[PDB]
Design a protein around this ligand. Structure first.
Ligand SMILES: COc1cc(Br)ccc1CC(=O)O
Ligand SMILES: COc1cc(Br)ccc1CC(=O)O
Ligand SMILES: COc1cc(Br)ccc1CC(=O)O
Ligand SMILES: COc1cc(Br)ccc1CC(=O)O
Ligand SMILES: COc1cc(Br)ccc1CC(=O)O
Ligand SMILES: COc1cc(Br)ccc1CC(=O)O
Lengths: 262, 300
């Protein structure tokens, strides 16, 4: 019914496909960043995962923030001592965009262990707004995922949570996910989740909507499968800890499949 | 932001929201007449307001002849300036200037057709307006009407998640919001446009409640108190009460007497209780009511 906007879902999907390309970060920004690394960004994003669970933020908010950070770092060189200030202003802006009840600025200053002042956060907020030119309505993995979920027959909450979990893992590692569009990571996450839980595959109905086949998804699928296998060992663990919660059907406890047959 | 305040000449105040004032201004170099919205910053000491972040982000992406145009944004540390295209009046002031004249049917039909165009464009770009009312609809001398005041708008996902409950001016608020439904969708903007449609014909608000329960009661007394048959799930809704008086649906020709059969058909479908059965802006564009539609200039 109307909550799935039958008369607009196609128009919206098409429009998001266009926008994700305009909201895409530069795949090779870390090499041009003298003083920060993929590893530091991993720490930042993992932290943001924890900030979101402490303030009970939407996942969409987390994804937006990451988008803002990646786009910011695509044009703005940042010292490692300031990476957290960027991330905090990002999370503030995403919250104001997406949350019914955003945390106050004070709450954002608090989560930084007084590393930064309120004045610094608000000034960075302005800076990030300038750099993004107020272009904040960015498509996320989640926005694609929730549409793909409508093609399950029947709906499975384990599939849905597991797909969300995998999509979130991908936020952590610029290499290799900065090279893939949200719509494609969502597609890979959805197939991997579906395959893991029910043994089924990316459905023809989603081939009809996306134009994506297992063939076009294969590169991202191979990456995401490795990420899933190696996730217990990864230096960053906040997403796994989060996805133990029954809110998310404890999906981080599911075993990855050993092979994909793809 | 090719904008810079120096090139604007103030003309007169034209409006004030919570987050500032609007002035008619004139671009000294091009001649263009604009509306400048000043957003005051840190007046809450919380940075750039969420309303402004949403209005700018969404209005930058929404380029439609029936959606107000954000021409530029001036970003100063202490002040944010939004540069809009200027329109001479809102629909509330025109309906009030049209007191004892009425609005001619071709003009009502033109305005409703354009409103639905602008709204469909919003919904196709995953934007809910969530404050359609005559005050927020701008008209020009060429016969255009445009959705304005995106201060409560929101980018939605598919399917929708739970969003803010305190949405839509009361007289224009859909029953599903009044009943505290977990989810609401594009249908809430159509409800608003339905109320507006009726109001263009009569020049009086269709459901002028003075409280949430009075708003519902007035709706129920016009359209009948909804049951499981007309609206499955209604009796389970958070703020549904079994004790609700059960009013009969009055024949729809009595709700807006001067309206013709096509108009009544269209109106009925905009004010359908069940949000799933309520017509979409996209489908409404094809309704027979509009068969003979044109775009005349306003009569005043
Ligand atoms: C490396 O420094 C940090 C990085 C992050 Br992310 C969080 C916290 C700290 C320590 C601090 O901010 O006191
Ligand atoms: C605050 O800066 C902007 C805001 C808007 Br809206 C558009 C463009 C800019 C500068 C830029 O394009 O970098
Ligand atoms: C593969 O082509 C499309 C499929 C859909 Br659905 C939307 C947009 C495009 C153009 C593109 O994203 O390349
Ligand atoms: C509200 O005032 C203005 C409006 C515009 Br447009 C430009 C400059 C001013 C300053 C003043 O003369 O007060
Ligand atoms: C209340 O003042 C203004 C309102 C608008 Br709209 C534009 C410019 C001004 C001058 C100022 O920034 O004071
Ligand atoms: C009173 O506000 C306006 C008046 C005119 Br004319 C154009 C734009 C606006 C801003 C808005 O639509 O929010």
């Amino acid at each position: 019914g109307v909550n799935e906007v039958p008369d607009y879902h196609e128009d919206i999907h098409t429009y998001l496909r266009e926008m994700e390309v305009k909201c895409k970060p530069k795949v090779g920004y870390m090499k041009k960043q003298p003083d920060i690394t993929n590893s530091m960004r991993a720490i930042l994003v993992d932290w943001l995962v924890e900030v979101g669970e402490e303030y009970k933020l939407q996942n969409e908010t987390l994804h937006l923030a990451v988008n803002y950070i990646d786009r910011f770092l695509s044009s703005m060189s940042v010292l490692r001592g300031k990476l957290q200030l960027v991330g905090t202003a990002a999370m503030l802006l995403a919250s104001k965009f997406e949350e019914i009840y955003p945390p106050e600025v004070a709450e954002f200053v608090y989560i930084t262990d007084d590393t930064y002042t309120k004045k610094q956060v608000l000034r960075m907020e302005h800076l990030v707004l300038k750099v993004l030119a107020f272009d904040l309505a960015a498509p996320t993995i989640n926005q694609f995922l929730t549409q793909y979920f409508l093609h399950q027959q029947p709906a499975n909450c384990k599939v849905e949570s597991l797909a969300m979990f995998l999509g979130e893992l991908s936020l952590i590692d610029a290499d290799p996910y900065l090279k893939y569009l949200p719509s494609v990571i969502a597609a890979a996450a959805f197939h991997l989740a579906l395959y893991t839980v029910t043994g089924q595959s990316w459905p023809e109905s989603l081939v009809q909507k996306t134009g994506y086949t297992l063939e076009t998804l294969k590169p991202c699928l191979l990456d995401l499968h490795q990420t899933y296998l190696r996730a217990p060992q990864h230096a960053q663990q906040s997403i796994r800890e989060k996805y133990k919660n029954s809110k998310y059907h404890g999906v981080s406890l599911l075993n990855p499949p050993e092979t994909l047959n793809v | 932001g090719p904008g810079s305040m120096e090139n604007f000449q103030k003309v007169e105040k034209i409006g004030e929201g919570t987050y500032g004032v609007v002035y008619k201004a004139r671009n000294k170099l091009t001649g263009e007449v604009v509306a400048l919205k000043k957003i005051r910053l840190d007046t809450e000491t919380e940075g750039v307001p969420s309303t402004a972040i949403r209005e700018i982000s969404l209005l930058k992406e929404l380029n439609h002849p029936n959606i107000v145009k954000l021409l530029d944004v001036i970003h100063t540390e202490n002040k944010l300036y939004l540069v809009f295209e200027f329109l001479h009046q809102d629909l509330k002031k025109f309906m009030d200037a049209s007191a004892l004249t009425g609005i001619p049917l071709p003009l009502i039909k033109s305005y409703l057709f354009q409103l639905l165009q602008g709204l469909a464009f919003c919904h196709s770009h995953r934007v809910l307006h969530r404050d359609l009312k005559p005050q927020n609809l701008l008209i020009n001398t060429e016969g255009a009407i445009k959705l304005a005041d995106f201060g409560l708008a929101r980018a939605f996902g598919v399917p929708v998640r739970t969003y803010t409950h305190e949405v839509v001016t009361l007289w224009y608020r859909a029953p599903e919001i009044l009943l505290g439904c977990k989810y609401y969708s594009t249908a809430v903007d159509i409800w608003s446009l339905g109320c507006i449609f009726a109001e263009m014909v009569t020049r009086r608000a269709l459901f002028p409640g003075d409280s949430e329960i009075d708003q519902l009661f007035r709706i129920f007394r016009t359209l009948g108190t909804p049951d499981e048959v007309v609206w499955p799930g209604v009796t389970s809704m958070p703020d549904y009460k079994p004790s609700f008086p059960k009013w009969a649906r009055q024949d729809f020709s009595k709700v807006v007497p001067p309206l013709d059969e096509d108009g009544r058909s269209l109106l009925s479908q905009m004010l359908h209780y069940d949000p799933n059965k309520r017509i979409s802006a996209k489908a409404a564009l094809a309704h027979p009511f509009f068969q003979d539609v044109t775009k005349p200039v306003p009569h005043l």
